[PDB]
Amino acid sequence: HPLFKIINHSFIDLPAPSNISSWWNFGSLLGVCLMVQIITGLFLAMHYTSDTMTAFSSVTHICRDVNYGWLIRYMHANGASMFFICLFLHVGRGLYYGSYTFMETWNIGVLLLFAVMATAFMGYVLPWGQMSFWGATVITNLLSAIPYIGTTLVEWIWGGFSVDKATLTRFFAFHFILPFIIAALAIVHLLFLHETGSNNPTGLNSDADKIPFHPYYTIKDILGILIMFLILMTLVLFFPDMLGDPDNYMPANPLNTPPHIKPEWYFLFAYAILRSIPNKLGGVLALILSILILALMPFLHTSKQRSLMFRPITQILYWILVANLLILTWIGGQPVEHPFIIIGQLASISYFSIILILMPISGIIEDKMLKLY
Amino acid sequence: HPLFKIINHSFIDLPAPSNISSWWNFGSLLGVCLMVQIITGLFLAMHYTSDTMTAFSSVTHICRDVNYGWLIRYMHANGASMFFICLFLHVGRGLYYGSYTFMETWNIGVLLLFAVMATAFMGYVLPWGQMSFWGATVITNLLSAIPYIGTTLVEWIWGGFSVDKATLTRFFAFHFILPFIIAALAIVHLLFLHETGSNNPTGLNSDADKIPFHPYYTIKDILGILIMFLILMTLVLFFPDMLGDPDNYMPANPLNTPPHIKPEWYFLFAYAILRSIPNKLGGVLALILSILILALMPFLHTSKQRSLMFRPITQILYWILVANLLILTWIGGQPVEHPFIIIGQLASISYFSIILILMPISGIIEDKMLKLY
Amino acid sequence: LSRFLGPRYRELARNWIPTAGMWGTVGAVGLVWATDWRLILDWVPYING
Amino acid sequence: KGFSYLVTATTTVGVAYAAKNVVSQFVSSMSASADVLAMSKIEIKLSDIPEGKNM
Amino acid sequence: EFGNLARIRHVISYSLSPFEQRAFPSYFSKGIPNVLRRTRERILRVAPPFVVVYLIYTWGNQEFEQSKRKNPAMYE
Amino acid sequence: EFGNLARIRHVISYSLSPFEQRAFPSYFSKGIPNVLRRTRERILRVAPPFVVVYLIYTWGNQEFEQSKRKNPAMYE
Amino acid sequence: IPSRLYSLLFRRTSTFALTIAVGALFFERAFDQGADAIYEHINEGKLW
Amino acid sequence: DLELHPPSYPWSHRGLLSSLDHTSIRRGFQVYKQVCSSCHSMDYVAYRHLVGVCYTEEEAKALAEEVEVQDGPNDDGEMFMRPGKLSDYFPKPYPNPEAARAANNGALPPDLSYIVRARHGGEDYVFSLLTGYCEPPTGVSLREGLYFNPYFPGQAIGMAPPIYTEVLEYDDGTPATMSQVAKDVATFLRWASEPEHDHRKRMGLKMLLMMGLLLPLTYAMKRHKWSVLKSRKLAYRPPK
Amino acid sequence: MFMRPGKLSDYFPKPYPNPEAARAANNGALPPDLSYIVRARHGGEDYVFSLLTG
Amino acid sequence: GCVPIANAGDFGGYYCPCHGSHYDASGRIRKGPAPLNLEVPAYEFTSDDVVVVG
Numbered sequence A, B: 001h002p003l004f005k006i007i008n009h010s011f012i013d014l015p016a017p018s019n020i021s022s023w024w025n026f027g028s029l030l031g032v033c034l035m036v037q038i039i040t041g042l043f044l045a046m047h048y049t050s051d052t053m054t055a056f057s058s059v060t061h062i063c064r065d066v067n068y069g070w071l072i073r074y075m076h077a078n079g080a081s082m083f084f085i086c087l088f089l090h091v092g093r094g095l096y097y098g099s100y101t102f103m104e105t106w107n108i109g110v111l112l113l114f115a116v117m118a119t120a121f122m123g124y125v126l127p128w129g130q131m132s133f134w135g136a137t138v139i140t141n142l143l144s145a146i147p148y149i150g151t152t153l154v155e156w157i158w159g160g161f162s163v164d165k166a167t168l169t170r171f172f173a174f175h176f177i178l179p180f181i182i183a184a185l186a187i188v189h190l191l192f193l194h195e196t197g198s199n200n201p202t203g204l205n206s207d208a209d210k211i212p213f214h215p216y217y218t219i220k221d222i223l224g225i226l227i228m229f230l231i232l233m234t235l236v237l238f239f240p241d242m243l244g245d246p247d248n249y250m251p252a253n254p255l256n257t258p259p260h261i262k263p264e265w266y267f268l269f270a271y272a273i274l275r276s277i278p279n280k281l282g283g284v285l286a287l288i289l290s291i292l293i294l295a296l297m298p299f300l301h302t303s304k305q306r307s308l309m310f311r312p313i314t315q316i317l318y319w320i321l322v323a324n325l326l327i328l329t330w331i332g333g334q335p336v337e338h339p340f341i342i343i344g345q346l347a348s349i350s351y352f353s354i355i356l357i358l359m360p361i362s363g364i365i366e367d368k369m370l371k372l373y
Numbered sequence C: 001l002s003r004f005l006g007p008r009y010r011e012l013a014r015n016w017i018p019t020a021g022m023w024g025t026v027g028a029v030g031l032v033w034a035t036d037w038r039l040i041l042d043w044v045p046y047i048n049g
Numbered sequence D: 001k002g003f004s005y006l007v008t009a010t011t012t013v014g015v016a017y018a019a020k021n022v023v024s025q026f027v028s029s030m031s032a033s034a035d036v037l038a039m040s041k042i043e044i045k046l047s048d049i050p051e052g053k054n055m
Numbered sequence E, F: 001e002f003g004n005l006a007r008i009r010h011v012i013s014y015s016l017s018p019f020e021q022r023a024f025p026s027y028f029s030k031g032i033p034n035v036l037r038r039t040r041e042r043i044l045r046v047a048p049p050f051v052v053v054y055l056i057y058t059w060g061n062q063e064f065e066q067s068k069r070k071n072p073a074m075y076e
Numbered sequence G: 001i002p003s004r005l006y007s008l009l010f011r012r013t014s015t016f017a018l019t020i021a022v023g024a025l026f027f028e029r030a031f032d033q034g035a036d037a038i039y040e041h042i043n044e045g046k047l048w
Numbered sequence H: 001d002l003e004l005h006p007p008s009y010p011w012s013h014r015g016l017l018s019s020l021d022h023t024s025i026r027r028g029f030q031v032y033k034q035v036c037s038s039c040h041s042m043d044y045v046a047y048r049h050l051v052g053v054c055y056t057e058e059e060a061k062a063l064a065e066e067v068e069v070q071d072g073p074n075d076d077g078e079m080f081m082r083p084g085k086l087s088d089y090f091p092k093p094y095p096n097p098e099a100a101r102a103a104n105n106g107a108l109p110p111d112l113s114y115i116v117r118a119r120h121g122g123e124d125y126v127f128s129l130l131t132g133y134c135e136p137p138t139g140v141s142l143r144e145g146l147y148f149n150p151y152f153p154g155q156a157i158g159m160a161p162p163i164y165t166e167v168l169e170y171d172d173g174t175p176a177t178m179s180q181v182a183k184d185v186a187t188f189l190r191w192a193s194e195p196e197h198d199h200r201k202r203m204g205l206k207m208l209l210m211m212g213l214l215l216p217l218t219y220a221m222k223r224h225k226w227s228v229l230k231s232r233k234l235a236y237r238p239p240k
Numbered sequence I: 001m002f003m004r005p006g007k008l009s010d011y012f013p014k015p016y017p018n019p020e021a022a023r024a025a026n027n028g029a030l031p032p033d034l035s036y037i038v039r040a041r042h043g044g045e046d047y048v049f050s051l052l053t054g
Numbered sequence J: 001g002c003v004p005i006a007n008a009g010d011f012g013g014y015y016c017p018c019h020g021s022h023y024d025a026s027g028r029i030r031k032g033p034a035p036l037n038l039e040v041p042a043y044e045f046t047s048d049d050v051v052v053v054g
């Protein structure tokens, strides 16, 4: 049957490696999170109004008067946080196990990552709190950095001299429409992966040992979905605000700036980099490269072994990379003052030098140790 | 790229019949219209507010203050009208040439038709005029006809005792989200068809004469797109209100009822049927069957010839069916009074008797004339 | 339908009947539960409330 | 078999119970919010209307 | 796909290059006759239903008017 | 798809039915040893970067505080 | 033992579904009741 | 910035599965009605919300009919006023932001609907601020309309001590000590910023229980369907 | 509140602050918004002319 | 669900311009396709000048 054929080839019988660990669950979790977000987003859209007079009032009306509306709203917010947790672990799996040699899958991935970051940014602007308004102005201002056409572009997006209702409404439209483009790009993602099949943690050709997916990696994905739902509901029902900003519960006052302005936990690494570079433009570029350096990653693989299971020096460099990514996440939070700044500057220098320079040199050294080079 | 293969497999090296007329353009036009609607809808969504205090004000702000906002709004409205024109001609092509024997393609089609009608209904509710509000109440009331769970369902959809802001906002969310489901269902529609290939106006096996699509039916689709754009822009730029209702330019007054309540013209045939049946429930059912009778159509084919090119009696019955479909479209417009009612009652009886009874009997007679039966 | 007016066809159905009823039963129970239909659930002693 | 399947049957009810609950709240969300539900006691002045008139 | 679509035999097929042939050979020369040929093979199947739609539409309109027209005998 | 994935030879593969084997054979019996075996092959590669992240984080905090602290000698 | 159960309500898939649905129908009653007891008691004196 | 960081207090609404004390929410609503409503607003809280929290329908109406509210347009078109309704929101203490600014010496008393949620460590902050009007130390001097509250950013809050011991009398009779009043109003403001605190925690208990059942099982089903492979014993027997 | 001379950004002034004042001042009738009257009235331009001259 | 128009119709009560349902002064459907009589809310005649309709 031409509709069922797809599933049989893709979901029911696809030959999958028998030895893939729990990390390979995470991408499926991302898809589930996407649906969850879409579903919760749809049930936020039946009561949200994208008017600057009524946006905060509509959000409070959702939390206070709609039956279980607080549940759907905090599920949406903590599901965005869970989406970025699963996204970061998915990207870390791709970096560690050499999955970036699937170059088309990797490039569709980094496009999906850019789209998800833009969607989450405009979604965080949407409740029109104090923190949303000052956050929007800030990043929209980021664009002004552009050398020649910057001012125009910023004003275009804002739709006026400064973010105001003009922005909110177009940000509602764009935040509505981009997750469906993300779903289509995810179909292209899984598509370009079906042409190749998944990788295994040993990094070897797993053609001799492949098993079906229906009874082996389906119940595994169901168990991972159950664990992710446990973490999401203990994030929603017990510590709902632990992943938020108290200043977003104040209305947007264009006159005042919340003093402790900071991007959400997931944008921090980038925030740190931006702050680190003295030049505004430099910051914007580095920021972009921060995400883009990944796309650049499949051209930096200089080893004869795909995975890092048998590569201890590059394992050490990888965990140092995870370490200073956590450091950059912390610095972003810290305010502008000594010595947070220097760490930020170094941490960014170390991040770009480990990804660009240290890992291919280490792979060359590791090939020399096995009498291969 | 593997994708290029899919890109070619459906649009470049696809073997198409060499003799398909201009009617086979129409489905591609529908896809273009879908995109056009989505694009125009996105540019309506950057300024529209789904609040009952501000919806009419936002629509007037689009028409008066946004640069070329009147152009995008009237392109959206007349593109919905063009969508239904192309949809009706696509369905008429499928009925005339025996294309309903592609049963899966036909059923995905009638699902797409139901989704498009629901999308257009909620979109017409969206500007919150006088006509939109009374039209919504009317059809939402249609649901109340349900024998046991009707009241609840109506109240659910309304989201309250009577359509009010609760409805408008959820109708904005649903009207936003359904054209992407329509696009996915159209992808399934295209798949279920390529498995079998398109039909030709002679209704014969065209395997001996097939040509490529890139240079032969692409420039033809481009010419059809150009002609459809000519008709759409002469509908927008010259007669922007010949298909709409003037009473939609008044704000929604719950206290004031209009003297005559209509949906937009493409719902009329159904409207007539509903009004014709005395029983409320009967009307609702017949109404549904009006659309559903089509799905039922592939089981009523009793002829040994697929197309109506060589079948003159069933051609006469088909044009009588088109004739009383036009009659039902006219009656819906006419008010409730003699003799519009009787025509409506007959026209509905003749419509259901021609589709259900007269065409298979005529096909049996036509098979008897060729010494086949 | 000509082919379906058959002797074995009938036997098959008869053999299939019990299973069919079971499935309807599951759905009926399901609908009652999912909808929290109280008209029906009010009959059940424990489920009441 | 009865031990292994009983676990499948047990799990199902549990999931089934959660699935009805999740779907139930969602379904319920679209139902009337507290604001509207709290509508009653409209006051009407008899003097307002004289015979042969509606208001 | 192409190559496995069908089996024909001994059917020779000649053709010409687009740039080698006139773009609109006898376009109005035979086009008109053909269009007219076409219309006369389909007009009797197509037109009389729409003719009686026009008669029913007019009839309805006029009948409706007469219906609305006051009954002179009434109110007197 | 399956059947055309790879070419192996003479590799016999025995297996048992799920219901025929214990669900958690020696789960904590060997699970613990193995988990511990695992942790000792990866702890030296994983842990010391996060250890020096903890030291840098504390250092930064303290240093920042000292930075903020007031020097009485400053005013004189 | 379960055997009797299996051969009766867990071996035929139709019956498997029946037992699941029926059990779930009652489970809610029990779960809600039991759960509420736990929650309310934890916060007894603070409710209402 | 440099600010005193309010300590952690042993509240009751902190318990993972612990709900708000509702008598304290009732007392804190009384504190807001008699003290805090003169200057602060509660735009997103309406009497109906209270019903089922610490008050009954009739009582709530009592509360509602104890205040005056404007009532849209008269038939004549002249805006009129009416007895408060269970559907009425809490009254504005200042028709417009400017009014508040003017009356409160330029300070805009923030809407105390989400204050606890909007202030970092709100519940604590609130308690601390209301109970933290200590004397400015040497070296710092504040202008009129300012007060040295270590916790307040800038330690210069326009609001004056709003709670003097025995400021108001609790109807329940619980001694109205400044603290007993600050704790009650912090519980109430908390409730205000999250009327669903209690309902949610119930679900939480339920969710845990369900996961505590489903999670273990799903694991047994997975280990059943994966045992087959996990017992596979490969063996290579080349022709040799 | 305070009243100021209109600006190019000001909209056209209201005759009445609310529609119930229009009902009170026009013997129970509500004079409709004339912004889209021509578009809202079937054959508006003609209607308008006719009504005003009829 | 349209609004019946008061003081119009062939039964001196109501008429619904949507499909021609004529309601008598009692609000009972007398002619047309309307299924049931208009609903009477459970009002309250506190006084000959005050009626609390639900």
Ligand code: HEC
Residues within 6 Å of the ligand: H031, H032, H035, H036, H037, H038, H039, H040, H104, H107, H108, H109, H110, H115, H119, H126, H129, H130, H152, H153, H156, H157, H158, H159, H160, H162, H163, H185, H186
């Ligand atoms: C009842 C005991 C309370 C409580 C719990 C609070 N107040 Fe007030 N308040 C008033 C004014 C003029 C301000 C603004 C002053 C300024 O911004 O300089 C405030 C502010 C607050 C806050 C916000 C603190 C912050 O960091 O923004 C909070 C949490 C607060 N108050 C609590 C005025 C008054 C009153 C009129 C004299 C009275 C009465 C109250 N407040 C009472 C209370």
Ligand code: HEM
Residues within 6 Å of the ligand: A034, A037, A038, A039, A040, A041, A042, A043, A044, A045, A048, A059, A073, A076, A077, A080, A083, A116, A119, A120, A123, A124, A125, A126, A127, A175, A176, A177, A179, A180
């Ligand atoms: C098409 C599906 C979606 C719709 C209709 C939708 C709609 C909405 C709406 C109406 C809001 C405002 C209500 C609120 O404040 O929570 C919102 C907020 C938000 N959305 Fe979405 N959304 C969708 C998908 C997503 C996705 C996929 C993400 C993740 C990338 C996302 C991230 C967010 C975030 C972070 C917020 C802010 C939540 C907060 O106030 O803290 N949304 N969304």
Ligand code: HEM
Residues within 6 Å of the ligand: A023, A024, A025, A026, A027, A028, A030, A031, A034, A087, A090, A091, A094, A097, A099, A100, A102, A105, A106, A108, A109, A110, A112, A113, A116, A182, A186, A189, A190, A193, A197, A198, A199, A200, A294
């Ligand atoms: C929008 C979020 C994403 C979704 C829904 C998604 C979805 C998936 C799915 C379903 C798989 C197959 C299952 C698996 O192996 O985990 C997968 C694998 C993969 N994805 Fe993604 N993905 C996302 C983001 C990304 C990103 C950002 C990248 C690039 C860094 C990426 C690169 C990959 C790679 C390389 C694989 C192959 C795994 C392997 O064989 O090792 N994905 N993804």
Ligand code: HEM
Residues within 6 Å of the ligand: B034, B037, B038, B039, B040, B041, B042, B044, B045, B048, B059, B073, B076, B077, B080, B083, B116, B119, B120, B123, B124, B125, B126, B127, B175, B176, B177, B179, B180
């Ligand atoms: C995802 C794409 C779409 C978006 C974002 C969208 C968005 C909107 C918005 C914001 C409006 C209100 C502005 C207005 O009054 O014109 C609107 C109106 C409307 N839309 Fe869409 N739309 C989309 C696709 C469609 C499609 C496919 C149809 C056709 C079935 C459609 C039919 C309508 C109609 C009939 C109206 C009412 C126009 C009127 O005021 O007369 N829309 N749409």
Ligand code: HEM
Residues within 6 Å of the ligand: B023, B024, B025, B026, B027, B028, B030, B031, B034, B087, B090, B091, B093, B094, B097, B099, B100, B102, B105, B106, B108, B109, B110, B112, B113, B116, B182, B186, B189, B190, B193, B197, B198, B199, B200, B294
């Ligand atoms: C959402 C709007 C629709 C789109 C975008 C769409 C798209 C298409 C496209 C691209 C084709 C192939 C080109 C052609 O033959 O015209 C096609 C063919 C077809 N469609 Fe649709 N379609 C739509 C609605 C429908 C509906 C409502 C039906 C059912 C009545 C339907 C039934 C068919 C059939 C039977 C064919 C085969 C044509 C033949 O071989 O004769 N389509 N459609």
